[PDB]
Automatic annotation (TrEMBL):
<feature type="active site" description="Proton donor; for dehydratase activity">
    <location>
        <position position="199"/>
    </location>
</feature>
<protein>
    <submittedName>
        <fullName>GphF</fullName>
    </submittedName>
</protein>
<comment type="function">
    <text>Involved in production of the polyketide antibiotic thailandamide.</text>
</comment>
<feature type="active site" description="Proton acceptor; for dehydratase activity">
    <location>
        <position position="36"/>
    </location>
</feature>
<feature type="region of interest" description="C-terminal hotdog fold">
    <location>
        <begin position="141"/>
        <end position="280"/>
    </location>
</feature>
<feature type="region of interest" description="N-terminal hotdog fold">
    <location>
        <begin position="4"/>
        <end position="130"/>
    </location>
</feature>
<feature type="domain" description="PKS/mFAS DH">
    <location>
        <begin position="4"/>
        <end position="280"/>
    </location>
</feature>
């Protein structure tokens, strides 16, 4: 059995054909779980659930080390609110490649009713495609002022989650350069795709949006059509993103974006199709 900071370990499931993982987390461990806030409450980032699903795809589905890991048709349901230092049990159950993720207070977790649903979707695994993928395009865009973005966003994100080092935009497209630091970079090979690194890619989308719209009632990921992970344990990527055309030119309740992550050398690391954003 392969250790994972969020999934935990396999445990018996009550359903005959289901496979289950449970682990304990807290705002202190993984530490990035204590560094995203909404209205003075510690709120677990939705990228947490995407990493758990990829980690389950790796461990539930046999294959080659270089296989592509896939999560599809993902919906994020309730937020997970942590109280500082108080442990939460996290659970991923899967049957016939469908998964669901729940959390519970550890002392109450014997009752299925104590478990709150956070994410659902499908997992899969495919051999690495030999097809040419494409490269990071030369956008020759306008630099986005990241110091202004970070000052705006400091109410939601602490120091471990300020990992965008450069961002340039042209229309609704942008290229970001994101890099883990400190402990997160140290631990990046424990993850399929470190949540702090994928959050940084998503914040590149936010930074594009917040160059035009208000950052109050901020956009929150609600799901995505597909994520494909082609290399595991990465620490630094350049990300190409594209926002779909918005309903409004002034202020939107929703946005949709596609993203491609490339390693520093230029190979495609991950794809995200139709990330759905909605204002909280
Ligand atoms: Mg989130």
């Amino acid at each position: 059995e392969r250790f994972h900071p969020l999934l935990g370990r396999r445990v018996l499931d009550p359903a005959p054909g289901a496979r289950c993982f449970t682990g304990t987390v807290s705002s202190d461990r993984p530490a990035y779980l204590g560094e995203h806030w909404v209205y003075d409450a510690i709120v677990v980032l939705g990228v947490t659930y995407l990493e758990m699903a990829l980690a389950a795809a790796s461990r539930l589905l046999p294959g080659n080390a270089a296989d592509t890991l896939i999560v599809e048709d993902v919906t994020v349901w309730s937020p997970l609110v942590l109280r500082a230092g108080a442990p939460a049990r996290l659970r991923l159950r899967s049957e016939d490649e469908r998964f669901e993720i729940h959390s519970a207070e550890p002392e109450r977790s014997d009752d299925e009713s104590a478990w709150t649903r956070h994410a659902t979707g499908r997992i899969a695994r495919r051999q690495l495609s030999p097809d040419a993928t494409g490269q990071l395009p030369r956008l020759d865009g306008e630099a986005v002022e990241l110091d202004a973005y970070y000052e705006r966003m400091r109410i939601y994100y602490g120091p471990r989650l300020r990992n965008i080092r450069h961002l340039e935009r042209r229309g609704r497209e942008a290229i970001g350069h994101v890099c883990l630091q400190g402990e997160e970079a140290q631990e990046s090979a424990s993850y399929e795709l470190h949540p702090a690194l994928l959050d940084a890619c998503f914040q590149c989308v936010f930074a594009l949006i917040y160059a035009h719209e208000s950052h109050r009632e901020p956009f929150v990921p609600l799901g995505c059509a597909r994520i494909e992970l082609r290399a595991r344990g990465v620490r630094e990527v350049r990300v190409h993103l594209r926002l779909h055309p918005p309903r409004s030119t002034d202020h939107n309740q929703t946005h949709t974006a596609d993203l491609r992550l490339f390693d520093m050398e230029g190979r495609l690391v991950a794809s995200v199709d139709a990330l759905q954003l909605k204002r909280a």
